[PDB]
RNA sequence: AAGCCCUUGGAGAGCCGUAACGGUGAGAAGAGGGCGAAGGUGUGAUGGGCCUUCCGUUAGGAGGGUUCUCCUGAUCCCUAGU
């Protein structure tokens, strides 16, 4: 799993921050979004509600923003991740 | 004027910011805004109030000015944090 992700950060385009991806996702212009378990529940439904409006695959992450951000490498946590380019990884099928 | 909210915005190997604690990807910075204390300023107030000149000196009568620039300052308030 992590190897697949580590490839995306290497070259594939990524989006960090809910506001941008949530702005973007409603327009149906994202390859995929992965969310850690630590998302505030007020937004989780909206993602799930907006998930079916253009059928964008979503992976649920059991982790928090930290390990997601630790894998992301940013010192601070990331609640969600936005993708507009899979690049060369093999994640989208998930 | 703080605080708290609205868009935009997009930043970390660091940035924002405090008297202090802190805030920051859950959107910081910066731009625009909104709700919005105390107070303050106009008006009320060509009326009185304050001092004062003089003549009248019973009875009263007639004028003058009442500005400007600055400072500290409450245990008297509201406003915030912690």
Swiss-Prot record:
Protein name: Large ribosomal subunit protein eL30
Key word Ribonucleoprotein present: yes
One GO process term, biological-process aspect: translation
Tagged with keyword Flavoprotein: no
Gene field: rpl30e
PANTHER family: RIBOSOMAL PROTEIN L30
GO-annotated molecular function: RNA binding; structural constituent of ribosome
UniProt keyword list: Ribonucleoprotein, Ribosomal protein
InterPro entries noted in UniProt: Ribosomal_eL30 (IPR000231), Ribosomal_eL30-like (IPR039109), Ribosomal_eL30-like_sf (IPR029064), Ribosomal_eL30_CS (IPR022991), Ribosomal_eL8/eL30/eS12/Gad45 (IPR004038)
Annotated family: Belongs to the eukaryotic ribosomal protein eL30 family.
GO cellular component: cytosolic large ribosomal subunit
One protein family per Pfam: Ribosomal_L7Ae
HAMAP family: Ribosomal_eL30 (MF_00481)
């Amino acid at each position: 799993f992590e190897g697949e992700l580590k490839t995306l950060l290497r070259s594939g385009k990524v989006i960090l921050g809910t506001r941008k991806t949530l702005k973007l996702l409603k327009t149906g212009k994202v390859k995929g979004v992965v969310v850690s378990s630590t998302l505030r529940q007020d937004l989780k439904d909206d993602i799930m509600t907006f998930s079916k409006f253009s059928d964008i695959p979503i992976y649920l992450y059991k982790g928090s923003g930290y390990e997601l951000g630790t894998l992301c490498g940013k010192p601070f946590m990331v609640s969600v991740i936005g993708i507009v380019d899979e690049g060369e990884s093999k994640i989208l099928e998930f």
